[PDB]
């Protein structure tokens, strides 16, 4: 017949620094490090949201609790998985680019070639409504 999407995928990423893998991430937001970045972040099976922050930054720290919630909040989403990664602590892959922090990003499904960058209000809810429409899969109710 006449069909077939060759596409393209080859773990397009690169990093020089990486943080140690956590013994267990039994919390609201999954800890994603350059070491296990392409493991949790990269995944065309389920949607994932990566949030880059800095321990030295004050504006980003005050958000820690503002972002955490979202993690346990979206827990009702077997498709969406919230996670965080310390850029400064671990180099960021590509095309993922982080010049100014905080830096929030989103890893869509089968959209690796062209990711997404959260550009709006850093409000717990603002994040939910953002995915409710962005997340290809989205929640059952909506």
UniProtKB/Swiss-Prot annotation:
Location comes to:
Endoplasmic reticulum; Endoplasmic reticulum lumen; Melanosome
Feature type site, description Contributes to redox potential value:
58-59
Species this chain originates from: Homo sapiens
Q: How does the record describe its quaternary structure?
A: Part of the major histocompatibility complex class I (MHC I) peptide loading complex composed of TAP1, TAP2, B2M, MHC heavy chain, TAPBP, PDIA3, and CALR. Interacts with ERP27 and CANX. Interacts with SERPINA2 and with the S and Z variants of SERPINA1. Interacts with ATP2A2.
Gene for this protein?
A: PDIA3
Q: Per UniProt, which keywords does this protein have? A: Acetylation, Adaptive immunity, Disulfide bond, Endoplasmic reticulum, Immunity, Isomerase, Methylation, Phosphoprotein, Redox-active center, Repeat, Signal
Q: Where is the Thioredoxin domain?
A: 8-136
State the function annotated in the UniProt record.
Protein disulfide isomerase that catalyzes the formation, isomerization, and reduction or oxidation of disulfide bonds in client proteins and functions as a protein folding chaperone. Core component of the major histocompatibility complex class I (MHC I) peptide loading complex where it functions as an essential folding chaperone for TAPBP. Through TAPBP, assists the dynamic assembly of the MHC I complex with high affinity antigens in the endoplasmic reticulum. Therefore, plays a crucial role in the presentation of antigens to cytotoxic T cells in adaptive immunity.
One term under GO cellular component: extracellular exosome
The protein here is known as Protein disulfide-isomerase A3
Q: Which residues carry this modification: N6-acetyllysine?
A: 13
């Amino acid at each position: 017949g006449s069909s077939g999407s060759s596409g393209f995928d080859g773990n397009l990423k690169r990093y020089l620094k990486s943080e140690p893998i956590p013994e267990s991430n039994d919390g609201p937001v999954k800890v994603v490090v350059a070491e296990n970045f392409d493991e949790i972040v990269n995944n065309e099976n389920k949607d994932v949201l990566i949030e880059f922050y800095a321990p030295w930054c004050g504006h980003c720290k005050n958000l820690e609790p503002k972002y955490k919630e979202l993690g346990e909040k979206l827990s009702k989403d077997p498709n969406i998985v919230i996670a965080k990664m310390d850029a400064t602590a671990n180099d960021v892959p590509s095309p993922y680019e982080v010049r100014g922090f905080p830096t929030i990003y989103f890893s869509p499904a089968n959209k690796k070639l062209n990711p997404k960058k959260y550009e709006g209000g850093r409000e717990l809810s603002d994040f939910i409504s953002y995915l409710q429409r962005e997340a290809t899969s989205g929640p059952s109710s909506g």
